[PDB]
Design a binder for this molecule. Structure first.
Ligand SMILES: *[C@@H]1O[C@H](CO)[C@@H](O[C@@H]2O[C@H](CO)[C@@H](O)[C@H](O)[C@H]2NC(C)=O)[C@H](O[C@@H]2O[C@@H](C)[C@@H](O)[C@@H](O)[C@@H]2O)[C@H]1NC(C)=O
Ligand SMILES: *[C@@H]1O[C@H](CO)[C@@H](O[C@@H]2O[C@H](CO)[C@@H](O)[C@H](O)[C@H]2NC(C)=O)[C@H](O[C@@H]2O[C@@H](C)[C@@H](O)[C@@H](O)[C@@H]2O)[C@H]1NC(C)=O
Ligand SMILES: *[C@@H]1O[C@H](CO)[C@@H](O[C@@H]2O[C@H](CO)[C@@H](O)[C@H](O)[C@H]2NC(C)=O)[C@H](O)[C@H]1NC(C)=O
Ligand SMILES: *[C@@H]1O[C@H](CO)[C@@H](O)[C@H](O)[C@H]1NC(C)=O
Ligand SMILES: C[C@H]1O[C@H](O)[C@H](O)[C@@H](O)[C@H]1O
Length: 257
């Protein structure tokens, strides 16, 4: 079967066929999300992703190769097949390379690159082109809360009026301070017990997260998950740690009004 959606990525911008041209070889880029046909992507059971009747195509299968639109019947078969890993990557199976936005700006051209699980490599296939705004409820039914740039995140009693408990879940798989959307939940390293803080969004692997089906919030590069340190909310420390399924690693999003 087939179905059509937008594809939201870095900084909440959308995958867009540049200038709305359908000529073979036209690059894909980031552009602010809308309803224009050059942002509407049809996913077919043959693993093609189509816009304006043509296919998302790797113009080469090397690190740094450009991704373009191209006639689906004349492109190389290997170059038009894509899958959508549950962590939000868009992968070309033949090469193993993944769709990447190398800069945050509008008009950045999308490339196939080595998978480093970067936030620049995160995408969401959806008709809602706005970030989802939610509280993140965890251990002891408390809420995850921001506390400024460079500072730790930590747990507090949930309050409908606390803006610092309000998170924008962006299409690039970043978790952002809703009121200050240039700031990202960031692990301060990839090792167990590294602290989770807020830092300027930079596309990094340390800023990419995945909400899995076991109630964990996973950092794909490290493999490790958000953890209320020592099950002790008074420490005011959230770390990354291996997944245990314990109550201090369970989370659920609660959509905000
Ligand atoms: C695949 O392409 C990437 C983008 O060109 C390479 O990473 C980039 O390497 C640049 C130096 O050549 C570096 O200044 C860029 O910031 C970096 N981009 C990022 C953020 O990944 C990548 O090169 C590998 O990784 C980089 C960071 C260095 O460690 C290089 O020595 C590595 O070769 C390319 N991968 C390969 C396998 O060449
Ligand atoms: C993809 O490239 C194909 C090969 O060049 C195009 O099919 C060819 O379209 C020609 C111009 O319309 C037509 O004279 C040829 O007979 C046909 N060739 C073959 C081998 O089918 C194709 O065009 C689409 O498909 C054809 C069948 C017609 O329906 C066209 O009007 C379609 O545009 C190219 N696809 C696209 C979307 O451009
Ligand atoms: C989250 O932050 C967003 C962005 O600042 C807030 O959305 C703005 O809200 C005002 C008032 O309703 C609107 O007029 C703007 O159009 C909104 N902007 C955007 C870009 O969406 C939002 O209210 C915040 N809180 C929640 C719960 O979503
Ligand atoms: C939790 O952390 C606080 C703050 O550091 C500390 O005073 C308290 O003793 C800890 N509780 C436990 C059970 O370790
Ligand atoms: C480069 C761009 O120019 C304008 C269009 O509305 C976009 O969808 C985009 O393609």
């Amino acid at each position: 079967t087939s179905f059509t959606r937008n594809i939201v990525g870095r900084d909440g911008l959308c995958v867009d066929v540049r200038n709305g041209y359908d000529t073979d070889g036209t690059p894909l880029q980031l552009w602010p999300c809308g309803t224009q046909r050059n942002q509407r992507w049809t996913f077919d059971s043959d693993d093609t992703i189509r816009s304006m009747g043509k296919c998302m195509t790797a113009n080469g299968l090397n690190n740094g190769s450009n991704i373009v639109i191209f006639n689906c019947s004349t492109a190389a078969e290997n170059a038009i097949k894509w899958e959508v890993p549950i962590d939000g990557s868009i992968i070309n199976p033949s090469s193993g390379l993944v769709m990447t936005a190398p800069r945050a700006a509008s008009r950045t051209i999308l490339l196939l690159e080595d998978n480093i699980y970067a936030a620049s490599q995160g995408w969401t296939v959806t008709n809602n082109v706005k970030p989802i705004v939610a509280s993140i409820v965890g251990y002891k039914e408390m809420c995850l809360q921001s506390n400024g740039e460079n500072n730790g995140v930590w747990m507090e009693d949930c309050e409908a009026t606390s803006l610092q408990q309000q998170w924008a879940l962006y299409g690039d798989r970043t978790i952002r301070v809703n009121s200050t959307r240039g700031l990202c939940v960031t692990t301060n390293g990839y090792n167990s017990k590294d602290l989770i803080i807020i830092l300027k969004c930079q596309g990094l692997p340390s800023q990419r997260w995945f909400f899995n089906s076991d109630g964990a919030i996973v950092n794909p590069k490290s493999r490790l998950v958000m953890d209320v340190r020592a099950s002790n909310v008074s420490l005011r420390e959230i770390i990354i740690f291996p997944a245990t399924g314990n109550p201090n690693q369970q989370w659920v999003t609660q959509v905000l009004p």
